[PDB]
Design a protein around this motif. Structure first.
Motif, short mmCIF file in Angstrom:
data_model
loop_
_atom_site.label_atom_id
_atom_site.label_comp_id
_atom_site.label_asym_id
_atom_site.label_seq_id
_atom_site.Cartn_x
_atom_site.Cartn_y
_atom_site.Cartn_z
N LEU A 1 9.36 4.91 5.22
CA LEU A 1 9.89 4.45 3.94
C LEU A 1 9.18 5.10 2.71
N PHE A 2 8.10 5.83 2.96
CA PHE A 2 7.34 6.56 1.94
C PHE A 2 7.09 5.74 0.68
N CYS B 1 3.11 2.48 4.84
CA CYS B 1 2.53 3.69 4.28
C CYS B 1 2.22 4.71 5.37
N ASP B 2 1.98 4.26 6.60
CA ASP B 2 1.63 5.19 7.69
C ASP B 2 2.32 5.01 9.07
N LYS C 1 0.82 -1.18 0.00
CA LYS C 1 0.00 0.00 0.00
C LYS C 1 0.86 1.25 0.00
N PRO C 2 0.66 2.15 -0.98
CA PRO C 2 1.48 3.38 -1.01
C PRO C 2 1.01 4.45 -0.01
N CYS C 3 1.92 5.35 0.39
CA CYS C 3 1.51 6.45 1.29
C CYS C 3 0.96 7.66 0.50
N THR C 4 0.04 8.39 1.12
CA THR C 4 -0.53 9.58 0.48
C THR C 4 0.49 10.73 0.43
N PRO C 5 0.45 11.54 -0.64
CA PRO C 5 1.26 12.76 -0.73
C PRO C 5 1.02 13.68 0.49
N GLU C 6 -0.20 13.68 1.02
CA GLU C 6 -0.47 14.46 2.20
C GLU C 6 0.37 13.91 3.36
N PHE C 7 0.29 12.60 3.55
CA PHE C 7 1.14 11.93 4.52
C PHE C 7 2.63 12.30 4.37
N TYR C 8 3.13 12.30 3.15
CA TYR C 8 4.52 12.65 2.95
C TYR C 8 4.79 14.08 3.30
#
Lengths: 159, 98
Positions: B92-93, B46-47, A4-11
């Motif tokens: 790890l983004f 991811c989080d 699952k990828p992270c959100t740009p907001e999260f980044y």
């Protein structure tokens, strides 16, 4: 397996307080598994060791690492090849690094397929600030699947 | 007057079992530890930062027990641990940016 990828907001809300981790590839990874033994000592065939090996290769790829692999290495080969991996110039241009070692082991050390021991302190050292100027201030992850004794834990029943 | 570094820093090491103990491996499913690690990481990278993801692994490992009826070595246990000289969160983004 997918990650699952992270959100740009999260980044956006976390990068200022985290190790920089944006390069591509995210870093090199080494998965080194010893499964078949020599057995110039003691050590059993690690049935199941190929699933672990495969699972990590897959994970670290999906996570963005350029994955190197090695299998069935002697204590001395682990040392030499770990050193060569630590000295790769690709580290100058990546943000992080990952190393996984999967073998039989004792406390503080892992076995080569020859039943000789490689000290984990010697492993960490090859990647430290003096020996590995390329990874300075970069996070280095290690994962060590190896015995640290031979006692199996009977466990305890909860009150 | 330059900042200098200690000889060693910014590493984190996950270990499958504790000092003095052996590690649980399934001939069919690989090690308890590698398996927990991949699911926690594939789902949460991811989080959740890596040291926290190693805590969730610890939680999975703590709750598992060995199914080997016959050999007293049934209902047997293991515990994992991590050691850290990190100085910042390690996220790890995954999949960012595209």
């Amino acid at each position: 397996m997918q990650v699952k990828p992270c959100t740009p907001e999260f980044y956006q809300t976390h990068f200022q307080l985290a190790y920089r981790l944006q390069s591509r590839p995210r870093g090199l990874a080494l998965v080194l598994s010893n499964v078949h033994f020599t057995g110039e000592k003691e050590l059993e065939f690690r049935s199941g060791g190929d699933v672990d090996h495969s699972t990590l290769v897959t994970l670290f790829k999906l996570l963005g690492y350029d994955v190197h692999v090695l299998c069935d290495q002697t204590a001395q080969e682990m040392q030499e090849k770990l050193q060569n991996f630590a000295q790769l110039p690709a580290h100058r241009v990546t943000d992080s690094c990952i190393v996984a070692l999967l073998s039989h082991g004792v406390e503080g050390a892992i076995y080569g397929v020859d039943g000789k021991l490689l000290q984990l302190q010697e492993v960490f050292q090859l990647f430290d600030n003096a020996n590995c100027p390329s990874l300075q201030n970069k996070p280095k992850m290690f994962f060590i699947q190896a015995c640290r004794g031979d006692e199996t834990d009977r466990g305890v029943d909860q009150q | 007057p330059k900042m200098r570094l200690p000889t060693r820093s910014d590493m984190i090491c996950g270990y499958a079992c504790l000092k003095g103990t052996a590690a649980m491996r399934n001939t069919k499913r690989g090690s308890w530890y590698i398996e927990a690690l991949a699911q926690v990481f594939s789902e949460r990278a991811c989080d959740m930062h890596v040291a926290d993801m190693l805590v969730k692994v610890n939680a999975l490992i703590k709750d598992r027990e060995g199914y080997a009826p016959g050999t007293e070595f049934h209902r047997c246990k293991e515990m994992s641990e991590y050691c850290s000289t990190l100085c910042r969160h390690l996220y790890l983004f995954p999949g960012h940016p595209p």
